[PDB]
């Protein structure tokens, strides 16, 4: 299938070369899969989710996304125009407040929440959890991400935006999950992207067009933006049967565009998520 004049990153993911504008993907588009967007919530009623999104747990007073980061993330994961997987099921776990912050215990609880909740949802092709969030090194956060991962959910996590070694960096440094760095339109590592040996792959993260609150759209940048492209790609690939939750990260790395990024430090992988679509 093809989406003409798609946002650049959608085009990037289904291209071996930068500069293209069509996003080519398989029409299954993530249906059957579920992606838990652990964030600020999602504006489920946004027309772009076409009813495929829903809030499942909030740790706040409202289930509402009064931020947009979440809706933004949910959108690159699976809104109709801006998402990697146009037919995926989105579940919103508001572990983040309307300002984008929150506590490790609430983020860790959201994660245990999902590891349990997936058991009462119908996600025939797999469950992904996209975590466009992080903070400083925490063995408990790491740990929660590793339990989530081990409960059978593909954990995609932002590398972070400090232009530093993600080793610092939680859940980013939990070696069992998938640590997502960010890239720009020209194939360069995103100026803000974390790097290092715990990264597993890179996705488009520079000025990414997605859904916003209020029923609108907005382009923003970040490893938070690259994460969902890969959580979206994991969900797409899982619905395709190419991989499983447990080996989806490894499979995205093995099928990536290699050696294409520039500005990749020695020790960091030079791998770009690629859907490998063939018409």
């Amino acid at each position: 299938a093809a989406q003409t004049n798609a946002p650049w990153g959608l085009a990037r993911i289904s291209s071996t070369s930068p500069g293209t504008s069509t996003y080519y993907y398989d029409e299954s588009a993530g249906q059957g899969s579920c992606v838990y967007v652990i964030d600020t919530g999602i504006e489920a009623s946004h027309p772009e989710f076409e009813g495929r999104a829903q809030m499942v747990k909030t740790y706040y007073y409202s289930s509402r996304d009064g931020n947009g980061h979440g809706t933004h993330c949910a959108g690159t994961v699976g809104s109709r125009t801006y998402g990697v997987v146009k037919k995926t099921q989105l579940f919103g776990v508001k572990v983040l407040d309307d300002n984008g912050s929150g506590q490790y215990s609430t983020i860790i609880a959201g994660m245990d929440f999902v590891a349990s909740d997936k058991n009462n949802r119908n996600c025939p092709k797999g469950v992904v959890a996209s975590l466009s969030l992080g903070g400083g090194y925490s063995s408990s956060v790491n740990s929660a991400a590793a339990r989530l991962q081990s409960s059978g959910v593909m954990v995609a996590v932002a590398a972070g935006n400090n232009n530093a070694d993600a080793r610092n960096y939680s859940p980013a440094s939990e070696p069992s999950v998938c640590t997502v760095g960010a890239s720009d339109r020209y194939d360069r590592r995103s100026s803000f992207s974390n790097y290092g040996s715990v990264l597993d792959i890179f996705g488009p993260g520079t000025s990414i067009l997605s859904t916003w609150i209020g029923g609108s759209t907005r382009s923003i940048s970040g490893t938070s933006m690259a994460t969902p492209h890969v959580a979206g790609l994991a969900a797409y690939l899982m619905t395709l049967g190419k991989t499983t939750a447990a080996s989806a990260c490894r499979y995205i790395a093995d099928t990536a565009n290699k050696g294409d990024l520039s500005n990749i430090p020695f020790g960091t992988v030079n791998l770009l998520a690629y859907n490998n679509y063939q018409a």
Binding site: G100, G134, A158, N161, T227
Partner: peptide, 4 residues
């Protein structure tokens, strides 16, 4: 710290 938080979203990322």
């Amino acid at each position: 710290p938080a979203p990322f």
